[PDB]
Amino acid sequence: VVPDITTRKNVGLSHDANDFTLPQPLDRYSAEDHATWATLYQRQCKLLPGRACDEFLEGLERLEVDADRVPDFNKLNEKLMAATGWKIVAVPGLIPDDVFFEHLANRRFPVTWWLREPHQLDYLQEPDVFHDLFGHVPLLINPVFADALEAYGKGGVKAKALGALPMLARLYWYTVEFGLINTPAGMRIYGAGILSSKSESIYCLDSASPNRVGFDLMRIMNTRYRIDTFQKTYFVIDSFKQLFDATAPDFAPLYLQLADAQPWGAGDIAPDDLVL
Ligand SMILES: [Co+2]
Numbered sequence: 187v188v189p190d191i192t193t194r195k196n197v198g199l200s201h202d203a204n205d206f207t208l209p210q211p212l213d214r215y216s217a218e219d220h221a222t223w224a225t226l227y228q229r230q231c232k233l234l235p236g237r238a239c240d241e242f243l244e245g246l247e248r249l250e251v252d253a254d255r256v257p258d259f260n261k262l263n264e265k266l267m268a269a270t271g272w273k274i275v276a277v278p279g280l281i282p283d284d285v286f287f288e289h290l291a292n293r294r295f296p297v298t299w300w301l302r303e304p305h306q307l308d309y310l311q312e313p314d315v316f317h318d319l320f321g322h323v324p325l326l327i328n329p330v331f332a333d334a335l336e337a338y339g340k341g342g343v344k345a346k347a348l349g350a351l352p353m354l355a356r357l358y359w360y361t362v363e364f365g366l367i368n369t370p371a372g373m374r375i376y377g378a379g380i381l382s383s384k385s386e387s388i389y390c391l392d393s394a395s396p397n398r399v400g401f402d403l404m405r406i407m408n409t410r411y412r413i414d415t416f417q418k419t420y421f422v423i424d425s426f427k428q429l430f431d432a433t434a435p436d437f438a439p440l441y442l443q444l445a446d447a448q449p450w451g452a453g454d455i456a457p458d459d460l461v462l
């Protein structure tokens with residue numbers, strides 16, 4: 187057993203014991219880190235036109251996400267706060283789900299502060315600052331998307347009280363992390379896990395292999411996912427409004443009905459799916 191990357195990167199740093207935040211450690215970014223950031227940024231910006239939803243590419247520009255260095259979170263926050271009242275907060279790496287949703291409930295988006303090493307350029311399993319900031323943050327300037335996230339966050343309390351955090355986590359995964367959005371110009375991507383990826387960005391739109399299924403709240407909350415492979419199923423929304431509107435009803439009876447149900451496997455098609 188050797189220390190994992192999260193442990194190694196955080197040596198000598200602390201974090202709040204309750205909310206897991208710390209000030210962004212600006213001094214810890216090396217020349218190599220800025221170069222790695224610049225390489226990832228350039229790679230994604232070459233790949234994503236015609237694949238990412240237009241709002242994502244626009245958000246990168248409106249927030250002035252740096253092309254050439256790891257961004258200063260405080261500086262980005264000036265723009266994000268003026269747009270939708272959100273801010274990003276630095277965290278050490280993966281945090282508990284209850285803490286994560288509590289941040290979202292308060293319009294704080296947690297971002298892992300450290301970056302993958304150059305040898306991990308192609309892929310990192312852990313979240314890092316490229317995935318969290320480049321992948322997740324640009325859409326937070328869209329007020330409908332931002333409201334959906336806040337609503338997910340507020341749902342954390344009820345989910346925790348009912349032992350249903352994993353059901354809310356599935357909704358988050360299949361929307362915020364791996365969601366597709368249909369447009370008159372064809373299918374586009376809004377999931378951050380795809381937007382920061384070297385290759386999943388290609389597969390999710392070009393391959394006949396994955397299922398593309400119309401968004402359905404109950405179906406999604408009853409669907410397993412895997413973290414270590416490309417998604418076998420992507421869920422497709424018509425608009426960010428659909429995401430927000432999905433949060434309108436009381437989730438409590440949905441959780442209880444699902445508590446004793448057998449969940450769908452990551453690759454299953456349910457009898458009632460709208461398959462696209
Ligand atoms: Co700790």
Ligand SMILES: [Co+2]
Pocket residue numbers: 313317318322363378379
């Ligand atoms: Co993510």
